[PDB]
């Protein structure tokens, strides 16, 4: 009806159809702290919100008032709660309310309350048919919006809409192969469909990753994905890996490739490999190169790894003090 930004907007204390209600001023006490100097519009809307809340008035006019209270501060969860009471109690058309929430999210997409409201609506209606497309539109303006990806995961899981997501992931990796949210969605989809035990699938996933690392050697997301999908069975379980990485040293090196090498050696020394000592010193060398030269921001971390490996894998590590 009367938008909060309309040039002909009028304060509630000047509206005839609200003449019967006494507004209810905020009770901040005799000497306030963190007291906010509200504007006129704001204080007027909330003085009237407190009045309807206090009387538990469940009317059409209170419903319209919550719209303004939300727009002044969409983080007000108390107002959101009252609004949901009125939706049920007045029997309001819930598709019309979906139209409403989709607009609010478009303009304020980083607010917790607006996403939770949409979820409740979908729950009430039991209808996920608008969701993937709506979320895609939000992600088209900020491809990393945390609430958006969370809502997307919830919808897919609750309603089992898995069949097109991998295709969607591939599309966004095309647009920006550095998008960590998308690499996370990839793992989320595969985990819950085929899984990573299918040798064919794991094989596919590693080729693709190594392929992307070649295209963009300094993109950390790819490196973390490769490590993520191999580290549970154990890196040393895959013996071709080591030589294939060394074969990128020449023209594809990075502190990321070096760090991975250290992780491979680390696992090798845990599953008792051949050449125990040759492997140790290779690793201590790399830990040192990283701490002194290639990755000094992490000097305290790499010195810790170096000490750890020495403390438990040196030839003297099992030798009693008396020897």
């Amino acid at each position: 009806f009367l938008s909060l930004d309309s040039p002909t907007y009028v304060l509630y204390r000047d509206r005839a159809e609200w003449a019967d209600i006494d507004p209810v001023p905020q009770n901040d006490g005799p000497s306030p702290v963190v007291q906010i100097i509200y504007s006129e519009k704001f204080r007027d809307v909330y003085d009237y919100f407190r009045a309807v809340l206090q009387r538990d008035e469940r009317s059409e006019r209170a419903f319209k008032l919550t719209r303004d209270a939300i727009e002044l501060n969409a983080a007000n969860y108390t107002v959101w709660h009252f609004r949901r009471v009125l939706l049920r109690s007045l029997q309001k058309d819930l598709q019309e309310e979906m139209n409403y929430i989709i607009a609010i999210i478009e303009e304020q997409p980083k607010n917790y309350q607006v996403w939770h409201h949409r979820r409740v609506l979908v729950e009430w209606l039991k209808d996920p048919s608008q969701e993937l497309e709506f979320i895609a539109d939000i992600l088209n303006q900020d491809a990393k919006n945390y609430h958006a990806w969370q809502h997307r995961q919830w919808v897919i899981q609750e309603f089992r809409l898995w069949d097109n997501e991998l295709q969607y992931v591939d599309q966004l990796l095309k647009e920006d192969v550095r998008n960590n949210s998308v690499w996370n969605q990839r793992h989320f989809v595969i985990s819950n469909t085929t899984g990573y035990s299918d040798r064919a699938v794991l094989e596919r996933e590693v080729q693709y990753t190594l392929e992307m690392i070649k295209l963009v050697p300094h993109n950390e997301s790819a490196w973390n994905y490769l490590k993520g999908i191999l580290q549970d069975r154990g890196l040393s379980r895959y013996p071709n890996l080591l030589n294939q990485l060394l074969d990128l040293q020449p023209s594809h090196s990075s502190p990321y490739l070096i760090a991975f090498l250290v992780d491979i050696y680390e696992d090798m020394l845990e599953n008792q490999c051949d050449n125990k000592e040759d492997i140790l010193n290779k690793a201590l060398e790399l830990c040192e190169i990283l701490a002194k030269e290639k990755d000094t921001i992490r000097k305290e971390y790499w010195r810790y790894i170096g000490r750890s490996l020495q403390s438990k894998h040196s030839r003297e590590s099992d030798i009693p003090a008396s020897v």
């Binding site: 983080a75 709660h81 996370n184 989320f188």
Partner: protein
């Protein structure tokens, strides 16, 4: 040596730490490059102006900013009308770190205001007459503990508080943030924090909670908001800190976690990013770096012998440099990054992070690193609660005098 630059960010090798985009441009790299250019100007400004760098924490300016805010705010803070205990907490904690005492009439006025925010059925709301919610509940309790008087302690209705917590508890181990609200890892932390401080933890309050949190750790090593989600500094801090309170750190893979957070420090900027391939931000000086003291304490209890005895496992020098050179507003207050505007949230967490980076401690061992002038040194902070270590001890002791509600 005379030719040696004492500031890490200004050394000539430092230039090697700029972004390598492999000649493949995407939205992510374009945005990262913009920030690095803006930070380079800040670093280079001393050289271009021909002055010797001096890193000074502007104590006076920040104090005026806080002292005023604690009483009154402009309408720019309308979007925080439902978060007023947070404002109490952010401001009081900043003053505490700066070692500015709290006039006892201020203390009494804060107490009385928070009483108005307290729900008849337990917990605190974002303002007088608003419904209760775990986040402002966490902030309220923290603020009263910073004040730390009998008056403050007596504000909290402990029977109701426990009732409130129970009404939020889920069968799978998680908590709702509030009645009819959302579940995520923050809520476990909020609950564990207020319950432990006020001594209301029953035998079954947290059944399943450690397990639910552990499900939030992902393939990255860090922790997400709910199972399946990207790892993030804010949720990771909350998850680990809650586990420490419950003494269940071991439910996590501490090693992959440690590798994840240490990777979150930006090689060029010196500050921390919140998640892989995003931008640096002053507030993560606490949520991210705050994890290292927690991991240290955890690994040490497991008997880890490789642990340093004087430093946290991140670059303390470089973090201090980022905060002091890039995160201060000349007029007072601190901020996300250059070009951003000041606010009380970043004031709280930038200073909290500065303190972490200045103060190392592991039982008997104690070692400080203070960049710039010595007056920069702040009061220390507890890595689990982010209030003063003393204020934690004082509060826990006081509430241990009472029996857990229901006996």
């Amino acid at each position: 040596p005379v030719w040696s630059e004492p500031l890490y960010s200004l050394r000539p090798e430092h230039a090697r730490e700029r972004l390598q985009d492999d000649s493949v441009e995407t939205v992510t790299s374009i945005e990262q490059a913009k920030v690095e250019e803006k930070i380079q100007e800040v670093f280079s400004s001393y050289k271009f102006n021909h002055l010797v760098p001096r890193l000074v924490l502007q104590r006076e300016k920040h104090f005026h900013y806080l002292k005023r805010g604690l009483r009154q705010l402009t309408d720019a803070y309308e979007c925080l009308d439902a978060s007023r205990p947070w404002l109490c907490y952010w401001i009081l904690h900043s003053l505490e770190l700066l070692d500015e005492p709290i006039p006892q009439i201020v203390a009494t006025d804060v107490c009385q205001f928070l009483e108005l925010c307290q729900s008849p059925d337990g917990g605190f709301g974002g303002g007088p007459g608003q419904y209760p919610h775990l986040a402002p509940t966490y902030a309220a309790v923290n603020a009263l503990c910073i004040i730390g008087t009998e008056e403050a302690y007596n504000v909290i209705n402990r029977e109701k508080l426990l009732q409130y917590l129970y009404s939020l508890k889920q069968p799978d181990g998680s908590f709702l943030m509030h009645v009819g609200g959302e579940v995520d890892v923050r809520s476990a932390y909020c609950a564990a924090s207020v319950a432990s401080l006020t001594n209301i933890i029953t035998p079954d309050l947290f059944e399943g909670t450690a397990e639910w949190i552990a499900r939030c750790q992902n393939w990255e090593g860090g922790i997400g908001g709910v199972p399946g989600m990207e790892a993030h500094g804010g949720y990771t801090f909350c998850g680990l800190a809650a586990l420490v309170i419950l003494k269940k750190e071991r439910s996590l893979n501490l090693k992959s976690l440690l590798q994840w957070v240490t990777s979150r420090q930006m090689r060029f900027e010196g500050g921390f990013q919140g998640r892989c391939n995003k931008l640096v931000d002053g507030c993560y000086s606490f949520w991210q770096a705050g994890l290292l003291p927690l991991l240290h304490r955890a690994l040490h209890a497991q008997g880890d012998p490789a642990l340093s005895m004087s430093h946290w496992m991140f670059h303390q020098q470089a973090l201090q440099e980022y905060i002091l050179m890039c995160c201060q507003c000349p007029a007072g207050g601190l901020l996300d990054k250059p070009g951003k505007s000041r606010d009380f949230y970043h004031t709280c967490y930038c200073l909290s992070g500065l303190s972490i980076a200045q103060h190392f401690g592991s039982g008997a061992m104690l070692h400080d690193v203070v960049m710039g002038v010595p007056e920069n040194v702040l009061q220390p902070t507890h890595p689990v609660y982010n209030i003063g270590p003393d204020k934690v001890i004082q509060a826990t002791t006081h509430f241990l005098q009472k029996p857990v509600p229901g006996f």
